[PDB]
Amino acid sequence: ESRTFLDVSNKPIVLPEHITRIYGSAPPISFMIYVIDDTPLIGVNSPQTNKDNNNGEKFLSKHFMELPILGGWHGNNIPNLEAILAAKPDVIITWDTPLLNEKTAKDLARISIPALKVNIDDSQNYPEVFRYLGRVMQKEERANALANMAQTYLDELKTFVASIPEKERTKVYYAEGDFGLQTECDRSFHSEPLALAGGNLVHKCVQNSVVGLQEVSFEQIILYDPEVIIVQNPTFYKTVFREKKWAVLKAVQNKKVYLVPKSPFNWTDRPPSFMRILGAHWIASKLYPTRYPYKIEDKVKAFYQLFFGVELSNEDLKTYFKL
């Protein structure tokens, strides 16, 4: 009853009193379980340090950094079903999103391990998802502390963004890939925090592939005339200020081009995750440098203290985050 949950097929299942082994279906889930309690994680989905997520050894437990890779259901990856089954997690937590649910449900049937799914596409859902996972894992006080900070940060951002008239919303281009020529649709789980932060995302469409990465030409970016450019890849961030042709863009002239922080988890994407609680504030601070009413460096410090148990010096803020 207290241990009864609706599973991925909407059927009530009874979990063990104590979950000592758990597996997340994809990095958004695994990263979230980490900050609640890494102890029961049987594995990770991707390499702990990769192109989009850096410096983990400085921020994350040694236990987490030494976990084996078991794959997952997400872009450019596939699950290791035999290994997952062999590792005997008490429960699997999955990512409830339409482009992944079919394949996930199929494979989970084959595995025959209890599985729950959580809906994290709207970042406003993070508080309730944290509380839910706290009940599942019997880590209620920890998960509730995270949920409360999440709720506060999300409410503050919502109230701020509501104060910006629609005609005054900052035009933003999300520059992905090594050459800045991939982007996301304005409606995509890869670009959600840009819209949540009050951005007018210049490329208009609806995501129809898991990975996104819509192709856009240089000539199209010029037409879009973004006011701010948010950049994922550090090679592009250098290129856009080194190569003369990008100086046609007003954002480049005004130096309103910003590299997304990645230490230890990406602040905005690859994966989408609870980091967006902070990342969307960081984005808002860049979109609205005169109107944004909070001190972003203090939000970073408070967020890292609670979520990661890490104290950041002013030099750390510069080194890892350019803040």
Ligand SMILES: N[C@@H](Cc1c[nH]c[nH+]1)C(=O)O
């Ligand atoms: N330079 C980091 C990102 C970053 C650091 N400070 C601000 N952003 C990278 O490797 O992508």
